[PDB]
Design a binder for this molecule. Structure first.
Ligand SMILES: CCCCCCCCCCCCCC(=O)SCCNC(=O)CCNC(=O)[C@@H](O)C(C)(C)COP(=O)(O)O
Ligand code: SF4
Ligand code: SF4
Ligand code: FES
Lengths: 112, 118, 176, 117, 112, 96, 93, 208
């Protein structure tokens, strides 16, 4: 199939690393500009966590699309198009912890 | 294999815990029309529908409780379910048997098909 | 079949040039607009003394909903549920059971005025003129919950505005 | 054994003794019907399934009439349309205005067939 | 001469006939660089020859505009420029070649 | 309007027009708010004969779009339509 | 009528039980209850007598009522009841 | 038929559009796959997805096709196809007073050449197609969210996207900000099964 930006996973992994460097070097500015009440480590760990969620992906086309969406998210953060509400949406705080144990799920509700 | 799950934006709870059913809807027994039993349909699994305290309306926390996708063939539905990482459950289409019907049998001479009233 | 706005050259006659210079220096068009708004000053204002004076309305006005009753006193609603089916905002919720007499009477008829689009499709679909958007439009509430009307709220509304609702129906039903 | 009949010109191979309604169902045409049921004996009294056979001057009842080889069934011809409209008009002549109060409403064969034919 | 073309951004050309002839000759050359059996070359050559003959036939600007039915002569010049650019691009695209690929099965079937 | 002659003259001079003629406020020229009952006419299909729906079913006389060319198994150049005729200048007020 | 808790009962029979927290919404406020139970209002209407074997009721007013329906009056044990109106009719006996 | 209820049919425009469709198909056989003229006189040309720029540039610059105005640019999601997304181009020709349609197809991954170089209006239309459906347009000057929320995830106009979405907003007093939470509805959207079991139009009957 026709590629999007890369023809090999190695080429696709290169763009992921480039995005990570841009994201990693942006977190100190994001905390400073948005006046976040978190630490630089928390944001950088959060960036790592979101990258690690899409770690099982093997199709280079999907990898390119994820980086394309990754750059779009970074542009909003750099340009302060996002707000403190948008930035802190990754750090789910109002959401109560949902246990993943069967017995805990059994006690709560009919959730399969 | 297509793994668009990371691009659809669906949360993880509604990708793995779900159970998509692929079937041709059964004919509404109240009617003889069969136009609805021609296209394959895809629906999710029913979940909790509690009662709203204020008005008694049936509340829900299932965002996929109203999704009914229509497909031309079974293979397309299976492919679409595989694209989004949904555990599909295909039910084979049931077609009514060809039946031998004879109006003359209503007045049979030596058979039980002879009717007593018209 | 078409017209040219602008596209009008000015005459360069010495009289016309002098008139244009006088307009530029003495601000003739500015004084013209000043006179226009001064004339508007001495007009009679179009304000109405609300709430003592109310703006014009028509018998077709779509306002607060109400469930009407037959002259006999019984509800017209026979729970056909097509007013709920036609409602584009899905604001109507209807549940029905065979009443003690055996008639088709709703047990729940709930419309959230906070979701309704005041389209009228409900009053136009009802085959017995039961649900009818009445003439009331000033029913603002201090809380959100008051806008989630029950069957009791609608029935009460209908009994209050019946005289007017009937009169409006009588005035308009020939167009429907 | 399969004889050949035509539904709107299209060829179709059917068994001997097959009714017109089944021949039309084979190609995908569902002739309107009230009295006919697949699991009941053929009655032929509702007269809604009347269809025009090409070159024939009379409209047969598809629910009862068995096909003959070479027949061309004109499901959507003008004779069939007029027969369906007349039968629906006769059915609805004495039918009560209970649609709002009738529980069959919204899933009524008489309503849908009146809307369509 | 015409004071203005009416349209904003379109300037009056003091030499319409010469410009039209030059543009049409350039278009004809670029079409001559195209294979003969191609339908684009044949159709565009026919149109350009008709327009060039009409230009050579009538020296009057307004009568030429009425005969061309392309609006004002400056619009005709712009159309000729666009046609020349299109011919140059089609020289690279080469659309006279057979179909790239047939639609996949039921790709243009409606309804579902 | 309930405006004195002096006020009306001042208003007309300041505006430069006769405002008392085309008053914006409505006093009596409006239609009555209690109109007589109407009687609307029936359409062209309200007849008891020669009115079969098959002869007037526009919704069922539509057809699937006609396929003109499918890749699946000297002509003159053709425009999508005749070129648009040049518009003509208005004869009421050609130049505003 | 009044529920044992002291709360008026609606025409549908709904009344919050004493062991129901939802009754607290009526503490400083009222419970909206219609005081014109339709079932009581229709039964008040008398049964009209018509000599004909089949009559038709439109709810009164013509186009301002309900779809016209025809009611059989053959059963002498019962009275024909309009589906929409609820009015009762009886053939003289 | 005739009489007031039916809509009059104009054969002249039908013939003209069919002729122009044949013309376009002859000129561009490399990309044109199918040509149709609907009964209400609307011309559609079906183009292989690689033919976006060539066919549109031809329809914009050709002397016999001056579709210099991009009326619309939308996508249709049909999840029953391999290429579910169907990109539709609506063009207007002020010179010949007619309109034409160009339809291509694309997957959830295969990109489409951006027609910004052809029509400058295609910019925001392609941005909206990307935002709503997920179709990526290559060589696009600025592709990003145009209609959805800034931190929105998912493409809503897809047929498999839920009507109410997956997340909802509210103001929390603890965090002093608007927070996104999984969607919970006080009343569920009552899905209606409205399709009649009887065939309505015999002229569109698909083969068994
Ligand atoms: C303030 C907090 C901001 C958090 C936002 C962080 C983001 O924008 S996450 C978007 C980035 N997503 C990606 O790069 C997807 C990468 N796709 C992949 O397939 C990769 O995981 C690879 C290519 C398998 C390489 O990853 P691994 O080294 O195998 O693991
Ligand atoms: S209000 Fe009218 S339309 Fe709605 S359920 Fe009652 S009778 Fe039917
Ligand atoms: S006015 Fe419209 S939106 Fe409101 S209840 Fe009636 S039909 Fe529904
Ligand atoms: S279906 Fe009734 S006569 Fe055949």
């Amino acid at each position: 199939v026709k590629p999007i930006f890369s023809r090999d996973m190695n080429e696709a992994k290169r763009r992921v690393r480039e995005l990570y460097r841009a994201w990693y070097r942006e977190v100190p500015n994001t905390v400073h500009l948005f006046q976040l009440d978190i630490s630089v480590k928390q944001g950088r760990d959060k960036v790592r966590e979101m990258f690690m969620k899409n770690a099982h992906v093997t199709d280079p086309r999907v990898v390119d699309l994820l980086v394309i969406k990754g750059k779009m998210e970074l542009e909003e953060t750099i340009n302060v198009w996002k707000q403190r509400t948008h930035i802190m949406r990754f750090f789910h705080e109002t959401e109560a912890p949902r246990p993943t144990d069967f017995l805990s799920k059994f006690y709560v509700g009919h959730d399969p | 294999k297509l793994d668009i799950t990371t691009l659809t934006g669906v949360p993880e709870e509604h990708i793995k815990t779900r159970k998509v059913r692929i079937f041709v809807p059964a004919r509404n027994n109240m009617q003889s029309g069969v136009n609805n039993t021609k296209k394959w349909k895809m629906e999710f699994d029913t979940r909790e529908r509690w009662e709203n305290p204020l008005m008694g309306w049936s509340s829900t926390a299932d965002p996929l409780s109203n999704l009914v996708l229509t497909f031309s063939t079974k293979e397309d539905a299976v492919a679409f379910a595989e694209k989004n990482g949904w555990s599909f459950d295909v039910e084979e289409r049931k077609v009514p048997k060809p039946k031998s019907k004879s109006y003359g049998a209503n007045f049979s001479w030596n058979k039980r098909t002879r009717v007593s009233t018209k | 079949t078409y017209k040219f706005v602008n596209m009008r050259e000015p005459s360069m006659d010495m009289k016309s040039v002098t008139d244009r210079a006088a307009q530029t220096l003495l601000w003739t068009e500015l004084v013209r607009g000043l006179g226009m708004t001064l004339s508007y000053l001495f007009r009679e204002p179009a304000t109405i003394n609300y709430p003592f004076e109310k703006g014009p309305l028509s018998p077709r006005f779509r306002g607060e909903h109400a469930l009407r009753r037959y002259p006999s006193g019984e509800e017209r609603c026979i729970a056909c549920k097509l007013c709920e089916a036609v409602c584009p905002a899905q604001a109507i919720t209807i549940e029905a059971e065979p009443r003690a007499d055996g008639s088709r009477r709703t047990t729940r008829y709930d419309i959230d005025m906070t979701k309704c689009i005041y389209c009228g499709f409900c009053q136009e679909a009802c085959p017995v003129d039961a649900i009818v958007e009445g003439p009331n439009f000033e029913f603002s509430t201090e809380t959100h919950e008051e806008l989630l009307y029950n069957k009791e709220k609608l029935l009460n509304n209908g009994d209050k505005w019946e005289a007017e609702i009937a009169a409006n129906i009588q005035a308009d039903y020939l167009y429907r | 054994n399969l004889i050949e009949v035509f539904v709107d010109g299209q060829s179709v191979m059917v068994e001997p003794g097959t009714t017109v309604l089944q021949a039309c169902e084979k190609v995908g045409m569902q002739i309107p019907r009230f009295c006919y049921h697949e699991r009941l004996s053929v009655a032929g009294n509702c007269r809604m399934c009347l269809v025009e056979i090409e070159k024939a001057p009379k409209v047969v009842a598809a629910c009862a009439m068995p096909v003959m080889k070479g027949w061309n069934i004109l499901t959507n011809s003008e004779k069939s349309k007029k027969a369906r409209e007349g039968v629906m008009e006769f059915l609805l002549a004495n039918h009560p205005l209970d649609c709002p109060i009738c529980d069959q409403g919204g899933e009524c064969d008489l309503q849908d067939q009146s809307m369509m034919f | 001469l015409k004071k203005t073309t009416g349209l904003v951004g379109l300037a009056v050309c003091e030499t319409p006939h010469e410009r039209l002839k030059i543009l049409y000759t350039k278009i004809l050359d670029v079409l001559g660089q195209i294979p003969k059996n191609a339908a684009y070359r044949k159709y565009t050559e026919q149109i350009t020859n008709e327009k060039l003959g009409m230009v050579k036939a009538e020296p009057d600007v307004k009568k030429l505009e009425e005969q061309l039915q392309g609006g004002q002569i400056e619009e005709v010049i712009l159309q000729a420029e666009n046609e020349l650019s299109l011919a140059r691009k089609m020289l690279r695209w080469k659309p006279w070649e057979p179909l790239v690929e047939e639609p996949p099965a039921n790709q243009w079937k409606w309804p579902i | 309007a309930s405006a004195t002659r002096v006020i009306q003259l001042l208003r007309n001079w300041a505006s430069g027009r006769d405002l008392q003629a085309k008053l914006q406020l409505r006093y009596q020229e409006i239609s009555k708010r209690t109109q007589p009952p109407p009687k609307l006419p029936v359409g062209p299909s309200h007849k008891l004969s020669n009115n079969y729906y098959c002869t007037r079913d526009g919704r069922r006389e539509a057809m699937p779009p006609s396929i003109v060319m499918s890749s699946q198994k000297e002509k003159k150049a053709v425009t999508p339509a005749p070129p648009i005729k040049r518009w003509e200048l208005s004869k009421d007020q050609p130049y505003l | 009528r009044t529920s044992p808790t002291g709360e008026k009962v609606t025409h549908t029979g709904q009344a919050y039980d004493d062991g129901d927290y939802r009754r607290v919404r009526f503490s400083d406020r009222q419970k909206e209850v219609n005081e014109n139970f339709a079932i009581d209002l229709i039964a008040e209407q008398p049964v009209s007598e018509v000599g004909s074997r089949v009559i038709s009721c439109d709810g009164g007013g013509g186009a301002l009522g309900h779809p016209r329906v025809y009611i059989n009056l053959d059963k002498e044990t019962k009275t024909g009841t309009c589906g929409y109106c609820g009015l009762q009719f009886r053939q003289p006996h | 038929d005739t009489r007031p209820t039916i809509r009059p049919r104009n054969d002249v425009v039908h013939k003209q559009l069919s002729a122009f469709g044949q013309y376009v198909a002859e000129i561009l056989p490399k990309y044109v796959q199918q040509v149709q003229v609907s009964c209400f006189n609307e011309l559609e040309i079906f183009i292989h997805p690689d033919g976006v720029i060539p066919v549109l540039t031809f329809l914009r610059d050709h002397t016999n096709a001056q579709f210099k105005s991009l009326a619309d640019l939308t996508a249709v999601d049909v999840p029953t196809r391999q290429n579910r997304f169907e990109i539709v181009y609506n063009l207007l020709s002020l010179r010949f007073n007619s309109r034409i349609r160009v339809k291509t197809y694309t997957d959830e991954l295969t990109p489409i050449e951006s027609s910004v170089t052809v029509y400058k209006a295609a910019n925001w239309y392609e941005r909206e197609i990307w935002d709503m459906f997920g179709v990526f347009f290559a060589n696009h000057p600025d592709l990003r969210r145009i209609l959805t929320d800034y931190g929105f995830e998912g493409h809503p106009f897809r047929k498999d996207f839920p009507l109410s979405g997956y997340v909802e907003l509210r103001y929390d007093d603890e965090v002093k900000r608007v927070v996104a939470e999984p969607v919970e509805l006080a009343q569920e959207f009552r899905k209606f099964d409205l399709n009649s079991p009887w065939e309505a139009f015999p002229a569109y009957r698909q083969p068994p």
